[PDB]
Design a protein around this ligand. Structure first.
Ligand SMILES: CC(C)c1nc([C@@H]2CCCN2)no1
Lengths: 269, 268
């Protein structure tokens, strides 16, 4: 991968691997989410950032502040097949004092066709107290230089899905997958649970008949609290709807504390 | 990747990804095993086994047969760091009509230093009945021309670790991780539990104190029976010693064996 000519976005090509694909020999949404995280990590490394959190600035490190994901929204039009080359472009935008936003565009490397798009909202937190805060002018000034300053949205549409409010699933759920636990492969280099794991866990409670006859078109996921290495999770789903729509909730099996909520939209093959 | 000058082996370079590494920022053994599978698959394609099947030959596709790993033995000397380029060479070889192998040699792309080596034995399964069977003469004939004829072993020593018999762990185990279940990400393109899941499950029962202070040097794993999508597994470990361990994976219900193996670890 490499920064683009203006140095305000980053592109990387990936050849889809045999173990990255599902039953129809196309990349799973977890593979796509892993490639999104990877091109994002390479973008931050290319402009001088370290690995103690995602894109921690000098002033942030001094003040014990970290960026955390608040939401992830992914829309896929075509999943790339085993052996195909996918090109991903990514950039970050400053959203004033509220936080930042990272966007991605996925393209078929042969035809140049846009095959998918994604967005993510990021907020600032004190690494020790876990308390959120507005972004200071000093911090904003340190990272604004690597961002396009004019609006550049992967999702420019007036009332688009990426900004929809997600309600809380009411007991009892229509479907469930109980007692999910992370293994060592589910942790990142900092020993935290990887954000892609939460995607896999949300999808575990979708009935197999839906997975076998439909394709995932959109997934929106709100991240409330991180799951720790020794936590056990329950995945709950309820249908809300050719298209099938679902409301999702991930909570700790012990106390029932919410960790994630989201929605998925599927289309019959 | 590409076939080598003599067309009897295949090489491919890989740049280690951020999510493929552990706490010391070097590739995990599950990442290594996934890269082994990937260079293996590209080698199978480079000689005419299309992406319409998971490395399966024409006769295998006709008879509804799929490949099954019988055993895997991996020795790593140096795990490649995040962002490093590792070059992997692979080849296949028949051992008369009794064994079918896939070997690998891992190297540091810059220096050419051998950083690891692996071997595996294969059987076949009917994809519908799930009955195992040895590689048939008809299937073997479909790739013998792509194999070196004289022996070419990644582990050439007579009486080496890769061919050692593995005993069965006796109850009670010293350590355990119970109730492991596969999720959709743990399945291969044929909807079977993938090869790295059994490796990850064996290692789950190694105490954290060992993982944090030691590095995995050798892993040998025998595959007795596949775990199905709705099965629940118990991972058992007992120290036999460097630190050495005896491993067993069995179904949580009936206690049916699925895997047995050993690991050898070096203090950092
Ligand atoms: C690499 C550079 C453009 C950058 N990105 C970022 C933000 C942090 C949260 C999401 N991305 N800060 O600097």
């Amino acid at each position: 991968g490499s920064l683009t000519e203006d140095g305000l976005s980053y592109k990387e090509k990936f050849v889809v691997r045999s173990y990255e694909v599902g039953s129809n020999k196309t990349a799973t949404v977890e593979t796509i989410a892993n490639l999104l995280q990877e091109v994002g990590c390479n973008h931050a490394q290319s402009v001088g950032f370290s690995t103690d959190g995602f894109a921690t600035t000098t002033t942030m490190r001094k003040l014990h502040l970290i960026w955390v994901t608040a939401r992830m929204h992914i829309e896929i039009y075509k999943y790339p097949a085993w052996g195909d080359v996918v090109e991903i472009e990514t950039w970050c935008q400053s959203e004033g004092r509220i936080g930042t936003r990272r966007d991605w565009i996925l393209k078929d490397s042969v035809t140049g066709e846009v095959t998918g798009r994604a967005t993510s909202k990021w907020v600032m937190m004190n690494q020790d107290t876990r308390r959120l805060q507005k972004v200071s002018d000093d911090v904003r000034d340190e990272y604004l230089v690597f961002c396009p300053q004019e609006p550049r949205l992967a999702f420019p549409e007036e009332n688009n899905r990426s900004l929809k409010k997600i309600p809380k699933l009411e007991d009892p759920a229509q479907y469930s997958m109980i007692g999910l636990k992370p293994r060592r492969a589910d942790l990142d280099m900092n020993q935290h649970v990887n954000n892609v794991t939460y995607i896999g866990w949300v999808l575990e409670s979708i009935p197999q008949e839906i997975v076998d006859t439909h394709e995932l078109q959109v997934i929106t996921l709100d991240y409330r609290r991180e799951c720790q290495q020794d936590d056990v999770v329950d995945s709950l789903t309820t249908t809300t709807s050719n298209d099938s729509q679902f409301l999702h909730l991930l909570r700790l099996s012990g106390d029932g504390q919410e960790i994630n909520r989201g929605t998925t939209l599927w289309r019959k093959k």
